[PDB]
Scaffold this active site. Structure first.
Site, PDB file in Angstrom:
ATOM      1  N   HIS A  63       0.848  -1.216   0.000  1.00 20.07           N
ATOM      2  CA  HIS A  63       0.000   0.000   0.000  1.00 20.07           C
ATOM      3  C   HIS A  63       0.885   1.268   0.000  1.00 20.07           C
ATOM      4  O   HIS A  63       0.892   2.073   0.943  1.00 20.07           O
ATOM      5  CB  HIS A  63      -0.939  -0.036   1.222  1.00 20.07           C
ATOM      6  CG  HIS A  63      -1.950  -1.131   1.161  1.00 20.07           C
ATOM      7  ND1 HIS A  63      -1.985  -2.117   2.102  1.00 20.07           N
ATOM      8  CD2 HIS A  63      -2.993  -1.303   0.319  1.00 20.07           C
ATOM      9  CE1 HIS A  63      -2.956  -2.941   1.738  1.00 20.07           C
ATOM     10  NE2 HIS A  63      -3.645  -2.446   0.721  1.00 20.07           N
ATOM     11  N   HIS A  67       1.258   1.362  -5.850  1.00 17.03           N
ATOM     12  CA  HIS A  67      -0.145   0.934  -5.822  1.00 17.03           C
ATOM     13  C   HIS A  67      -1.101   2.120  -6.183  1.00 17.03           C
ATOM     14  O   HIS A  67      -2.025   1.952  -6.980  1.00 17.03           O
ATOM     15  CB  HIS A  67      -0.507   0.343  -4.426  1.00 17.03           C
ATOM     16  CG  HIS A  67      -1.946   0.042  -4.230  1.00 17.03           C
ATOM     17  ND1 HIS A  67      -2.587  -0.918  -4.979  1.00 17.03           N
ATOM     18  CD2 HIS A  67      -2.828   0.568  -3.353  1.00 17.03           C
ATOM     19  CE1 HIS A  67      -3.832  -0.968  -4.539  1.00 17.03           C
ATOM     20  NE2 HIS A  67      -4.038  -0.068  -3.580  1.00 17.03           N
ATOM     21  N   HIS A 101      -6.457   7.252  -2.610  1.00 17.61           N
ATOM     22  CA  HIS A 101      -7.276   6.245  -1.927  1.00 17.61           C
ATOM     23  C   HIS A 101      -6.618   5.494  -0.775  1.00 17.61           C
ATOM     24  O   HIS A 101      -7.352   4.995   0.063  1.00 17.61           O
ATOM     25  CB  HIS A 101      -7.936   5.251  -2.940  1.00 17.61           C
ATOM     26  CG  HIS A 101      -7.093   4.057  -3.248  1.00 17.61           C
ATOM     27  ND1 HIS A 101      -6.117   4.082  -4.228  1.00 17.61           N
ATOM     28  CD2 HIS A 101      -7.039   2.867  -2.611  1.00 17.61           C
ATOM     29  CE1 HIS A 101      -5.525   2.899  -4.174  1.00 17.61           C
ATOM     30  NE2 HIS A 101      -6.033   2.147  -3.199  1.00 17.61           N
ATOM     31  N   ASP A 102      -5.282   5.271  -0.800  1.00 22.17           N
ATOM     32  CA  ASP A 102      -4.604   4.559   0.310  1.00 22.17           C
ATOM     33  C   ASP A 102      -3.567   5.477   1.028  1.00 22.17           C
ATOM     34  O   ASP A 102      -2.634   4.982   1.626  1.00 22.17           O
ATOM     35  CB  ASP A 102      -3.976   3.234  -0.208  1.00 22.17           C
ATOM     36  CG  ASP A 102      -4.893   2.027  -0.210  1.00 22.17           C
ATOM     37  OD1 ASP A 102      -5.726   1.919   0.702  1.00 22.17           O
ATOM     38  OD2 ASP A 102      -4.683   1.103  -1.064  1.00 22.17           O
ATOM     39  N   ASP A 212      -8.882  -0.824  -7.555  1.00 18.90           N
ATOM     40  CA  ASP A 212      -8.098  -1.227  -6.418  1.00 18.90           C
ATOM     41  C   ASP A 212      -7.605  -2.711  -6.466  1.00 18.90           C
ATOM     42  O   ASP A 212      -6.541  -2.996  -5.927  1.00 18.90           O
ATOM     43  CB  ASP A 212      -8.878  -0.960  -5.142  1.00 18.90           C
ATOM     44  CG  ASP A 212      -8.039  -0.984  -3.871  1.00 18.90           C
ATOM     45  OD1 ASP A 212      -6.821  -0.613  -3.939  1.00 18.90           O
ATOM     46  OD2 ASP A 212      -8.607  -1.277  -2.808  1.00 18.90           O
ATOM     47  N   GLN A 264      -5.796 -17.850  -3.018  1.00 24.19           N
ATOM     48  CA  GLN A 264      -5.891 -17.034  -4.234  1.00 24.19           C
ATOM     49  C   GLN A 264      -7.073 -17.529  -5.050  1.00 24.19           C
ATOM     50  O   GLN A 264      -7.894 -16.731  -5.478  1.00 24.19           O
ATOM     51  CB  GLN A 264      -4.603 -17.131  -5.069  1.00 24.19           C
ATOM     52  CG  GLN A 264      -3.396 -16.436  -4.458  1.00 24.19           C
ATOM     53  CD  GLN A 264      -3.533 -14.935  -4.418  1.00 24.19           C
ATOM     54  OE1 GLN A 264      -3.503 -14.325  -3.358  1.00 24.19           O
ATOM     55  NE2 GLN A 264      -3.687 -14.301  -5.553  1.00 24.19           N
TER      56      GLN A 264
HETATM   57 MG   LIG Z   1      -7.200   0.653   0.789  1.00 18.34          MG
HETATM   58 ZN   LIG Z   2      -5.852   0.226  -2.457  1.00 17.61          ZN
END
Ligand SMILES: [Mg+2]
Ligand SMILES: [Zn+2]
Length: 307
Positions: A63, A67, A101-102, A212, A264
């Protein structure tokens, strides 16, 4: 300037930004310029905003800054394929939301913060980190010379922050399950109408999930390399959990690596395949994302079988 070879490639859903680290700020500027014009923002303001966003991503394994740009690029490819459908403010709000967003993520999930009574969990009851990422976006916009939305009216400034806030909160995976179920019903019956604002927010919400999780829609060697980064972060969380007398879930336990292919497989069948399937039903041009997800589900089924 952006090299000629990239100009063709950046348009496609499978583009991996991985190899162009020195170009990530400029790739974001080029995507903003292409999506809402060369005078979308005052260039000096946008460049200071971007570098402050970059500085506010920590050096965690997943993150991080890379990303943020990956997610932004995925949104750009959705907006480039779904012309006229999104307004100028939405195109503008969504690219910024994706980059932000992160913001200031510490490599810990909402469940850890809620489980170990972290100060952020007391301030933000649900969607803990996403509410903190939105707060970091507003604090950055309010820095001297960082207000990229200065040209907007009051009404427009408050609309874009709302597009951004709902978009950043839609990146909480805990909300994805219900949002997709509602969109799936709306589509099967025939109720889906993009002129209704509540439907729009849901369609945007699923686009944010698609963006995302887009590491699952790259070519297999890239998908596999990103998964190692996700797991390095998940395993570092599980190690802190062990120190505090709490046995972590298998996914965060580095001693349970052999369960990764099956984990996964379940993430693709339960989370990602349905996400891109629903997105494809609403936005047909996003089909390459479902096709790439399906190709990587087949590669994970091959790992489990021993191929
Ligand atoms: Mg996030
Ligand atoms: Zn994210």
């Amino acid at each position: 300037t952006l090299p000629v070879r990239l100009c063709k490639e950046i348009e496609l859903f499978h583009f991996d930004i991985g190899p162009f680290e020195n170009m990530w700020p400029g790739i974001f500027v080029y995507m903003v310029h292409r999506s809402c014009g060369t005078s979308c923002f005052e260039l000096e303001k946008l460049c200071r905003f971007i570098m402050s966003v970059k500085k506010n991503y920590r050096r965690v394994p997943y993150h991080n800054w890379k990303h943020a740009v990956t997610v932004a690029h995925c949104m750009y490819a959705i907006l480039q394929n779904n012309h006229t459908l999104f307004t100028d403010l939405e195109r503008k709000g969504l690219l910024i939301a994706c980059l932000c967003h992160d913001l200031d993520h510490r490599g810990f999930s909402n469940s850890y913060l809620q489980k170990f009574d972290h100060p952020l969990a007391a301030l933000y009851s649900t969607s803990t980190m996403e509410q903190h990422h939105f707060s970091q976006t507003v604090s950055i916009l309010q820095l001297e010379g960082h207000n990229i939305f200065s040209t907007l009216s009051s009404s427009e400034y408050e609309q874009v922050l709302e597009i951004i806030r709902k978009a950043i909160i839609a990146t909480d995976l805990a909300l994805y399950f219900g949002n997709r179920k509602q969109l799936e019903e709306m589509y099967q019956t025939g109720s889906l109408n993009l002129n209704n604002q509540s439907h729009r927010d849901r369609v945007i919400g699923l686009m944010m999930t698609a963006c995302d999780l887009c590491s699952v829609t790259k070519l297999w060697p890239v998908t596999k390399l990103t998964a190692n980064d996700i797991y390095a972060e998940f395993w570092a969380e599980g190690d802190e959990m062990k120190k505090l007398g709490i046995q972590p879930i298998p996914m965060m336990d580095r001693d349970k690596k052999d369960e990764v292919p099956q984990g996964q497989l379940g993430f693709y069948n339960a989370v990602a395949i349905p996400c891109y399937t629903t997105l494809t039903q609403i936005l047909p041009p996003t089909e390459p994302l479902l096709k790439a997800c399906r190709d990587n589900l087949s590669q994970w089924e091959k790992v489990i079988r021993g191929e």
